Structures are given as C-alpha cells and as structure tokens.
Amino acid sequence: MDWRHKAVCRDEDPELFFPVGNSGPALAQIADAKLVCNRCPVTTECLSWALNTGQDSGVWGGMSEDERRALKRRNA
Ligand code: SF4
C-alpha cells in the first residue's frame, strides 16, 4: 500500500511538479494528475508536503501551489 500511495505520487503529472507555461492542455494534464493524486491514500510524503506548504490536508493527496493554479485555470 505504501509503495502504491507513492506509486501514484511519481505516476501523477509532471505538470503538477512543474508550473505550466503558455499551454492549455497543461491544465487538463495537470487536472488529471490532480484527481488521481488527490483521490489516492495518504503517505508520510503527503503529510510532510502539506506541512512544508502549510496546507490543511490529511485524507486527500498532496498538491503544490502551482498545481492549484493549473486547476483553477482548467475550470475557468
Ligand atoms: S495524494 Fe499524496 S501519497 Fe498520493 S500520490 Fe499524491 S502526493 Fe503521493
């Protein structure tokens, strides 16, 4: 389970770890990782990440600030 939780960690969207440039698909790409990464269980990486970014989370997945930007733009 632990490796699986971090399986989706690295198996998410590189766009979630890297801020989008000027493309739109990046939002859809990022958005995909966002749903798959957010619905995945929790790991020490998830808790440690939230503390590093000061984000209130525990049951959900880990998401970067740039990632949230990609999401808001995706919804428009
Ligand atoms: S939700 Fe947390 S444990 Fe799951 S892949 Fe994303 S960062 Fe890793």
From Swiss-Prot:
GO cellular component, one term: cytoplasm
Induction: Activated by CRP. Essentially constitutive over all growth phases. 2-fold induced by ethanol, repressed by SDS and heat shock. Not induced by hypoxia, slightly induced by NO and in macrophage and mouse infection, 10-fold induced by cAMP. There are 2 CRP-binding sites in the promoter of whiB1, at low concentrations of CRP with or without cAMP transcription of whiB1 is enhanced via site CRP1, then repressed as site CRP2 is filled.
Note accompanying the cofactor annotation: Binds 1 [4Fe-4S] cluster per subunit. This cluster is stable to O(2) but very reactive to nitric oxide (NO). Following nitrosylation of the [4Fe-4S] cluster binds 1 [4Fe-8(NO)] cluster per subunit.
Keyword Transmembrane assigned: no
A molecular function (GO) term: dinitrosyl-iron complex binding
Variant or mutagenesis effect after changing W60E: Still binds DNA
One Pfam family here: Whib
Domain of life, per lineage: Bacteria
InterPro entries for this protein: 4FE4S_WBL, Whib
Domain 4Fe-4S Wbl-type: 8-70
PTM description: Can be nitrosylated by NO, 8 NO react per cluster leading to the formation of 2 dinitrosyliron thiol complexes (DNIC). These complexes are quite stable in the presence of air. Upon aerobic 4Fe-4S cluster removal intramolecular disulfide bonds are formed.
Cofactor: [4Fe-4S] cluster
Recorded consequence of changing R74E: Loss of 4Fe-4S cluster, loss of DNA-binding
Disruption phenotype: Essential.
Mutagenesis or variant effect for D13A: No change in 4Fe-4S cluster, binds DNA
Protein name listed in UniProt: Transcriptional regulator WhiB1
Organism encoding this protein: Mycobacterium tuberculosis (strain ATCC 25618 / H37Rv)
